[PDB]
Structures are given as C-alpha cells and as structure tokens.
Write an enzyme that holds these catalytic residues in place. Structure first.
Site, PDB file in Angstrom:
ATOM      1  N   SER A 132       8.516  -1.980  37.105  1.00 50.68           N
ATOM      2  CA  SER A 132       8.114  -3.267  37.822  1.00 50.68           C
ATOM      3  C   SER A 132       6.839  -2.907  38.653  1.00 50.68           C
ATOM      4  CB  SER A 132       9.143  -3.444  39.292  1.00 50.68           C
ATOM      5  OG  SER A 132      10.402  -3.896  38.501  1.00 50.68           O
ATOM      6  N   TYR A 150       3.663  -4.591  36.890  1.00 49.03           N
ATOM      7  CA  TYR A 150       3.387  -5.775  37.258  1.00 49.03           C
ATOM      8  C   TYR A 150       2.631  -6.182  38.318  1.00 49.03           C
ATOM      9  CZ  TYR A 150       6.135  -6.454  33.046  1.00 49.03           C
ATOM     10  OH  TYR A 150       6.776  -6.261  31.595  1.00 49.03           O
ATOM     11  N   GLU A 201      16.052  -3.063  31.876  1.00 55.12           N
ATOM     12  CA  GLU A 201      15.981  -4.354  32.449  1.00 55.12           C
ATOM     13  C   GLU A 201      17.198  -5.360  32.428  1.00 55.12           C
ATOM     14  OE1 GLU A 201      13.252  -7.595  30.144  1.00 55.12           O
ATOM     15  OE2 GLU A 201      12.404  -5.622  29.848  1.00 55.12           O
TER      16      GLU A 201
HETATM   17  O1  LIG Z   1      11.311 -12.969  36.300  1.00 54.66           O
HETATM   18  C1  LIG Z   1      10.440 -13.442  35.822  1.00 54.66           C
HETATM   19  C2  LIG Z   1       9.884 -12.762  34.482  1.00 54.66           C
HETATM   20  C3  LIG Z   1       9.105 -11.650  34.839  1.00 54.66           C
HETATM   21  C4  LIG Z   1       8.447 -10.882  33.553  1.00 54.66           C
HETATM   22  C5  LIG Z   1       7.784  -9.737  33.854  1.00 54.66           C
HETATM   23  C6  LIG Z   1       8.358  -8.689  34.975  1.00 54.66           C
HETATM   24  N1  LIG Z   1       7.903  -8.704  36.088  1.00 54.66           N
HETATM   25  N2  LIG Z   1       8.398  -7.929  37.037  1.00 54.66           N
HETATM   26  C7  LIG Z   1       9.266  -6.975  37.006  1.00 54.66           C
HETATM   27  O2  LIG Z   1       9.678  -6.497  37.941  1.00 54.66           O
HETATM   28  C8  LIG Z   1      10.133  -7.076  35.828  1.00 54.66           C
HETATM   29  C9  LIG Z   1      10.883  -6.005  35.508  1.00 54.66           C
HETATM   30  C10 LIG Z   1      11.625  -6.278  34.179  1.00 54.66           C
HETATM   31  C11 LIG Z   1      11.245  -7.026  33.322  1.00 54.66           C
HETATM   32  C12 LIG Z   1      10.199  -7.645  33.486  1.00 54.66           C
HETATM   33  C13 LIG Z   1       9.539  -7.738  34.666  1.00 54.66           C
HETATM   34  C14 LIG Z   1       9.035 -11.358  32.542  1.00 54.66           C
HETATM   35  C15 LIG Z   1       9.795 -12.492  32.296  1.00 54.66           C
HETATM   36  C16 LIG Z   1      10.059 -13.064  33.209  1.00 54.66           C
HETATM   37  F1  LIG Z   1      10.770 -14.292  33.194  1.00 54.66           F
HETATM   38  N3  LIG Z   1       9.999 -14.603  36.055  1.00 54.66           N
HETATM   39  C17 LIG Z   1       8.873 -15.281  35.433  1.00 54.66           C
HETATM   40  C18 LIG Z   1       9.107 -16.769  35.205  1.00 54.66           C
HETATM   41  N4  LIG Z   1       9.472 -17.422  36.461  1.00 54.66           N
HETATM   42  C19 LIG Z   1       8.893 -18.020  37.296  1.00 54.66           C
HETATM   43  O3  LIG Z   1       9.375 -18.383  38.303  1.00 54.66           O
HETATM   44  C20 LIG Z   1       7.496 -18.518  36.864  1.00 54.66           C
HETATM   45  C21 LIG Z   1       6.268 -18.770  37.762  1.00 54.66           C
HETATM   46  C22 LIG Z   1       7.000 -20.052  37.244  1.00 54.66           C
HETATM   47  C23 LIG Z   1      10.952 -16.878  37.026  1.00 54.66           C
HETATM   48  C24 LIG Z   1      10.490 -15.327  37.367  1.00 54.66           C
END
Ligand SMILES: O=C(c1cc(Cc2n[nH]c(=O)c3ccccc23)ccc1F)N1CCN(C(=O)C2CC2)CC1
Length: 340
Positions: free
Chosen positions: A234, A237, A318
């Site tokens: 995390s 990111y 994840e």
């Molecule tokens: O949770 C995520 C997300 C994050 C990531 C990257 C990420 N970011 N942060 C993390 O802590 C994480 C942990 C495990 C796996 C990935 C992550 C990848 C795909 C996703 F759908 N969102 C991205 C898409 N979403 C939105 O609200 C977007 C902004 C319009 C919902 C929230």
C-alpha cells in the site's frame, strides 16, 4: 486563527495543497495549458472512463483499427495530454484508468476547496470527518507501529518507513452505513495507500467503487475497494519521491466474510453467492501465528513468511470488497519514506 492541533492543521495543508494537485497531473502527462486544474470536471472524467469502457469492448469484440483509433482520438480530445499513444490494448487502458482514478479524486478536492473563520478550520469541516491525534504511547500506537515494521515486504527494500503521526478518524455516517456489516465474521484491519492528492476525496466521500463508466477490466480483481496486509504494498501507492518523501496511508476495518480465493486477474462485477470478499493469494503472507486483535478487529501484524502457493500472479496478498458499506475507516497515518 484555527484551534486544531498542529499535526492535524499540517495534514489539512497537505490534503488541500493545490501545488501537489498540479504535480500529480503533470506526472500523468496532462496538458495543463489546454486543461488546467480549474477546467477539470466530474462528468468530463466520467465520459473519459466511458470512452475507455468502449475501447476495451472494441478490442475484445473484433472492431476495426479505424474504430479504436477514433475512440482513442476522442479520449485525447476529452483529456488533453502533452508527451499520443494509441489506446488499443488492456495495458494502454489500465494506464489511463489509473490516471482517471487520480483525476476523479483531484477534481473532488478542487470542487470542495473552491466552494469569517480560519480557512484551515473551513477546509477541515468540508472533510466531514472527525480527526484526532493518537498519543504515541497508547495501545493503539503500540499495535499500529508493530504492524508497520513487520509487514514491510523484503522486496520493497528500496525505502524504510518511519511513523510521524497517527490519526484516529471518523467519517460522518460511516458507522451507521457500516451497521449492516458490523455483525459479519472475518473482520480485518487493512492498509490502503493512495496519493496525498486523493485524501480530500477519500475523507469527504470515503473509499468508493469506481464510477459506473469505468471498465471492470481496468482493475485486476474488478470494480472493488482494494487492501493489502503488507504495509509496503500500500505504501508504494503513495508514490513518494524526494520533493515529497512523506505519504499518507489508511487503516480500515474491512468486513471480509467468506473470502473467494483467487490467484490471477478476475474482472468481477459482483461476488458469487456464499462470498463477501476476494483474496488475491500472494507468494508471501504475514504469519497467521503472530496475529492480534484491536477493538473487535483482527490485525495481521505477523512477519512475512511463504504461503506455500507458487503458481500465482501476486508476490503478496490483497483484499477486495464490492460494497462501500463493508469498510470502516479507522486510522490515517502520516509516513516518512527513507530511500537508499
Ligand atoms: O481500491 C481501489 C483500487 C486500488 C488499486 C491500487 C491500490 N492502491 N492502494 C492499495 O493500498 C492497494 C492494495 C492492494 C491492491 C491495490 C492497491 C487498484 C485497483 C483498485 F480498484 N480503488 C480504485 C477505483 N476506485 C475509485 O474510487 C476511483 C477514483 C474513482 C475505487 C477505489
């Protein structure tokens, strides 16, 4: 003059920093002259997500090179850039999906901002989140700090993490919206890292599901809310550099329920009956023999040990939930990244 304590005021400053908003846009190669921060709109973004949804469908279902190029031309019309890569594949689409995810939350933070009392107190109220500093020597700060040192992955050795401030947070209406899942089994305190420029959006609106217009194929496990149990997964990111080696990470109580275990990408719209979450299996897992509890929530603060699984896409685990009511934001940590 604002009454809020200094780490809080300092958090409010970072979150509403208009300079970091521009930096984050230029990092995604946006054309600031053709489209500056003020000209950014929710529906422009939402329409750009829709063009990307159409791009992916046109690639999948056999469509002319001419067709995908016109859909691509329209994306670059809608969101002006300055480098024009053709959006003709899943890779090119994921890169634009990741940029729009950032634009959507930047536009959220700029809408609140540009919409008597100290301006800091005003901006703090627009968050509609109660923020308290957690005392360094509390049980909460005991548990939160151990979780960090331990669950930092061996492969993300490029930096070391140092805890500056730990904030206890409470979004308005989140506990009441959470009530239906407040009962659910498998409750874990998990990491969610994002750019600092997204925190106004995350506190004012909470962690959401991507707009209906966003392609489910643009995210590895589809349109959910993603968490890690390894702090560095995390923290990567946060996209911290050197002009800003300070990032923000969330700790949310997540209602996992029955976990649909997956090893590879699955562009899931809704979960199968009998499941409440998805667990992407990592090669390395934080030891279940060193797990602890905090306020009814399980904390996987165990050290990184092999899970056994080898035929996987993920080096680390994840977690994904597909209802916004399944998350309870509990803590915002301000971190210091020390690079080699
Ligand atoms: O949770 C995520 C997300 C994050 C990531 C990257 C990420 N970011 N942060 C993390 O802590 C994480 C942990 C495990 C796996 C990935 C992550 C990848 C795909 C996703 F759908 N969102 C991205 C898409 N979403 C939105 O609200 C977007 C902004 C319009 C919902 C929230």
């Amino acid at each position: 003059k604002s009454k809020l304590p200094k780490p809080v005021q300092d958090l409010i400053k970072m979150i509403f920093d208009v300079e970091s908003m521009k930096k984050a846009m230029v990092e995604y190669e946006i054309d600031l002259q053709k489209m500056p921060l003020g000209k950014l709109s929710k529906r422009q973004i939402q329409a750009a997500y829709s063009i990307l949804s159409e791009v992916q469908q046109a690639v999948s279902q056999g469509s002319s090179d001419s067709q995908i190029l016109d859909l691509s031309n329209r994306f670059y019309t809608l969101i002006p850039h300055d480098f024009p890569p053709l959006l003709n594949n899943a890779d090119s689409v994921q890169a634009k999906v990741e940029m729009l995810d950032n634009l959507l939350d930047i536009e959220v933070a700029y809408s609140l901002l540009r919409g008597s009392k100290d301006p800091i107190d005003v901006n703090y109220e627009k968050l509609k989140t109660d923020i308290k500093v957690v005392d360094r020597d509390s049980e909460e700060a005991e548990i939160i700090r151990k979780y960090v040192k331990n669950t930092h992955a061996t492969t993300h050795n490029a930096y070391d993490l140092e805890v500056i401030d730990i904030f206890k947070i409470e979004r308005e209406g989140e506990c009441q919206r959470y009530k239906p899942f407040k009962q659910l089994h498998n409750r874990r305190l998990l990491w969610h890292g994002s750019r600092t420029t997204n925190f106004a959006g995350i506190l004012s609106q909470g962690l959401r599901i991507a707009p209906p217009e966003a392609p489910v194929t643009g995210y590895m496990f589809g349109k959910g809310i993603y968490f890690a149990d390894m702090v560095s997964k995390s923290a990567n990111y946060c996209h911290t550099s050197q002009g800003d080696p300070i990032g923000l990470i969330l700790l949310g109580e997540v209602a996992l329920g029955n976990m649909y275990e997956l090893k590879h990408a699955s562009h899931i719209s809704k979960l199968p009956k009998g499941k409440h979450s998805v667990k992407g299996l990592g090669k390395t897992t934080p030891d279940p023999s060193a797990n602890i509890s905090l306020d009814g929530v399980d904390v996987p603060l165990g050290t990184g040990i092999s899970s056994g699984v080898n035929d996987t896409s993920l080096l680390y685990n994840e977690y994904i939930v597909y209802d916004i009511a399944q998350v309870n934001l509990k803590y915002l940590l301000k971190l210091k990244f020390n690079f080699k």
